Amino acid sequence: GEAQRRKEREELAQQYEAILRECGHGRFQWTLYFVLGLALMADGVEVFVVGFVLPSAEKDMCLSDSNKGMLGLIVYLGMMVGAFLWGGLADRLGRRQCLLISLSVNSVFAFFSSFVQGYGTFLFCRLLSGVGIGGSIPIVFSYFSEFLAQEKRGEHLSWLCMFWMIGGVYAAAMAWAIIPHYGWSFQMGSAYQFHSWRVFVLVCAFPSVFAIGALTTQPESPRFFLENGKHDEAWMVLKQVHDTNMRAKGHPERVFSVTHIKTIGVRALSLGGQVWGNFLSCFGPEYRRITLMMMGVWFTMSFSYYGLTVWFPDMIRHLQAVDYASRTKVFPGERVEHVTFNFTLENQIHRGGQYFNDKFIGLRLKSVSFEDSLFEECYFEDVTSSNTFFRNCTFINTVFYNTDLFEYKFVNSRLINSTFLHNKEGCPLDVTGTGEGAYMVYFVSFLGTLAVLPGNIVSALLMDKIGRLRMLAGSSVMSCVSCFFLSFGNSESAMIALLCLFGGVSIASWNALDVLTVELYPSDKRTTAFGFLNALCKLAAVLGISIFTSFVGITKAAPILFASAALALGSSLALKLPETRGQVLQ
Amino acid sequence: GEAQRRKEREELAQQYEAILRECGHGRFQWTLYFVLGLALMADGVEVFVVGFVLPSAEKDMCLSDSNKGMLGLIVYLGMMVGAFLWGGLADRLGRRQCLLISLSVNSVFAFFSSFVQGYGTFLFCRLLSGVGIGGSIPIVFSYFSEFLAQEKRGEHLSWLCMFWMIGGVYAAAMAWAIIPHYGWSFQMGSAYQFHSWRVFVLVCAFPSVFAIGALTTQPESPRFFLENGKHDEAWMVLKQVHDTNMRAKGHPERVFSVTHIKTIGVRALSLGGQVWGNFLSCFGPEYRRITLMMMGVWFTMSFSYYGLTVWFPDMIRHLQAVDYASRTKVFPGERVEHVTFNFTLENQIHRGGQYFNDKFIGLRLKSVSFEDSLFEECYFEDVTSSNTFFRNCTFINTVFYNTDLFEYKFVNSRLINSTFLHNKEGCPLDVTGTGEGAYMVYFVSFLGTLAVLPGNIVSALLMDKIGRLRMLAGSSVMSCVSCFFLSFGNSESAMIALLCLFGGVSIASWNALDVLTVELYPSDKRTTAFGFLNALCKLAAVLGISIFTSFVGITKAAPILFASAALALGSSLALKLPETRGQVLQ
Ligand SMILES: CC[C@@H](C(N)=O)N1CCCC1=O
Ligand SMILES: CC[C@@H](C(N)=O)N1CCCC1=O
């Protein structure tokens, strides 16, 4: 019974590999490579949009705390749902069909998010865009694997991981070239406003549309047809692959020699039942040790990588904040009287001042604090305030005309006979401000990805030469050693170098994990299992981000120990996995 | 009302601390340190006796399954009752009074257990010995804390755990030096027998007697007298402390400068009511968050620690059992006839044999199984049987002379005209049996405690330097990381190293928890609350042991996940506790 099933699946796999050797590589494989690289580029772009627009988003939607912290977790949760959903649906509907549906959903909801003005609606649109793009990596890898021969199956799959990095580079470049133009205030409707970050979101929603356009021209994988008892169109697809390959070779004169490939409301409930059957069969007697080791490896690597990747920029920001706090100026004791006096003062503290009959017209305040001051018959006009506070201050007969000094900028103050007139529009809470730091953020991201590059090249070249397990274990161990090396970092330059090193060493491990998870599952459960594991990866990413953003400024022992321990456990479970190099893809 | 009570308690605490600073440290504090360390040594010794004597105990009391599994739970339940009882009674009768009572109870019932011959009576005696020793740690910590000044209150209390450490070493040494002499068969009465494990139990009951002898010479804590409205003898005790301290210094000429100190069946029933009230008042408006966080931390830490600590030796035993089974031999089909044939065969299976007129004189059988055999006019003499069975066997005209082949060793057998003569004395049920493994058990226990040592030293040195909460949380997190590291264990050596690591990392956390629970309760509820929490610790120990002994041989994921989750929850609730370093003991 079950033995017969396994046997027949075995000669099916062998015959399919023979047909693939007959067809060979050439134009078809590379064409599909680029076509799927567009979807991976979209996946890579999607994880940078909210991170890049949080400043402007909180400016134009008046976002408080616990709202900026949810806008990254929203995309990660969206991918967590979408990966599982589309991975489950791909084994019953098809790789190309589900990829088209998911990419279309992503594009539509990304456009809609680009045009949303509210916050809750923005959360919903971002979550659904993440759902749409969540099933990109599983379907792409499981769809490209079914067109590659046994020989160079690792190198030909590892070159497919350049596109995530290219998407990251694209996002960084567009953010640098679009967002810095804060002047843009395109108007459509009194109640609504359109700034430049919306344009950035639009441009970052573009490449998914190109992915759909390229994918509509590609044929469904023959293996999916063969599994589901559909023989004729599988043969047609294989013939198309052969014809394209040989026309590209220049001998477009031979004929495909294969005639045949040996073959062995209510609707919603049926689909649910079938998907649950596939998911449970993933937890079968045949697939249990492999499944659990894969779960462990995916979870640990995701936790460590995402935790450190979010930790490095936060630590850079913290070091800059410490420098700023160290440079401040203090002016203890002042007595200014009867003068019109503006200024553009930044990063200052005034204590013990006594101001009488002073006119403050047209001044910019950035990180300026007045403490223990007294203002008496003063006058504030055209005051622009950023990170400015009044603590232990007393105001007597003062007038605030055309100022943004809201109620939250007076901390434990006392106003007597004070008048507020023509208050500027603004947030009811400190929303902080990001200025010149954006350029350095973009530069840091670009450096991270460029550091990723050499590991990609080396892993792609040596994946077949040394092996999947050797690559995975080697890169995991090197990453753990780097995690130890994070102790020797206390400046921005050192943190950038550490980011570069860790990003450059972990990518080989991720490449090996992708190829491994491709090769250890049969063609009737590849997308389901690999999508489930990628959903677990996204959940671990959420957990790791939450855990690692809490150690910035406390100590550097907790991040190092957590990352090193998780990576060591991941390498330990990775060394127990079966070897799949030199094996027919079955 | 209540505010006045809190205030007056406050200046009482402040004046008491001033008096303690005036008295200082010296000979009195170290003398009391050793005196209470004897009681902690007794506590440490008590938890090894049944574990060390279960082999010999089941040999000489014929213990079945469900009886060896209850002889550990009996001591844990005894301590669970005793901790609560003596902690409750200590706040109404006194620390030294209740410690004397509990230690005497422990000693008496330990001697009686040493001389018991039955099982039920042995259960009762061990349970009451556990009850006697249950209130050791609460009263000892809460009694020593009331003689220490603010300055080094953490260091001087953390040195108090080297004692439970050594007790373990003492128990291991005595077990190694006493039990291996199985020859000892001291006889007193025909129906009763005295082996060497009884001598071991006697020697392990000794140190409680020394604890009582040393405790009878120490004075009651002044704080207990001051709380209960008794002023004169509190002043006398403080004067004694001062006099001893200054005589030790070498200046026995100064005078105690303190003259006045601020002061705040039916009998048994009243005391019980008072205890109940104190406990309910713990479910006080002032102490409800603290109480619940303490409950959670104690329960989780006890569950994890005890579960893993019982899991490690069980896993070692399981690995040894697997190795032994992997050594097995099968001899299918035999025909032996007309020969005198002994042997010393271990771990074998004979199937399909046919024996005719065979004499079996003086053979040792260990883990030997005869299946589908036929014995005809056979003769068994001086047969020693261990884990030996006869299944689906037929005996015809066979004689069993001077053999221990009892009725339970013939499984679904058929005897025809068989004769049993001069059967050896022995159990009516299988008892298995432990030989050389005892030395390795003792060595493993010794290694565990020696691994505990460095954590003790470091915690004692750094308790004041870093803080109680930092120490607790740090050690809890490291313990969780170790729980993750239990994945890398598959041999006896690896399991021993893992036991050493986990024991070495959890002890700082336990030290910090003890000191913390000492310092967050007022002197009129210290013993009640701390004893209630220690009773909860023992109940959690029972639950954790029962849960964790069921995962041995199934998988290593359930233990790791349970322990890590519980320790993470414990650390989470530990980080929310108030800081008590740099605070007057109130
Ligand atoms: C280029 C790396 C890429 C991969 N396929 O390994 N990565 C890294 C983490 C998430 C992801 O898709
Ligand atoms: C002597 C240490 C003692 C304590 N009170 O901290 N321990 C450690 C593990 C369980 C226990 O009671």
Numbering used by the authors:
A (entry chain B), B (entry chain A): 137 to 400, 421 to 742
Quote the original article.
SV2A also serves as a receptor for botulinum neurotoxin (BoNT), which is the most toxic protein and has paradoxically emerged as a potent reagent for therapeutic and cosmetic applications. SV2 family proteins belong to the major facilitator superfamily (MFS) with 12 predicted transmembrane helices.
We also determined the cryo-EM structure of the SV2A–LEV complex without HCA2 to a nominal resolution of 3.38 Å. SV2A forms a dimer, in which the two protomers are in an inverted configuration in the detergent micelle. Thus, the observed SV2A dimer is functionally irrelevant. This is further supported by the higher temperature B-factors of LD4 in the local resolution map.
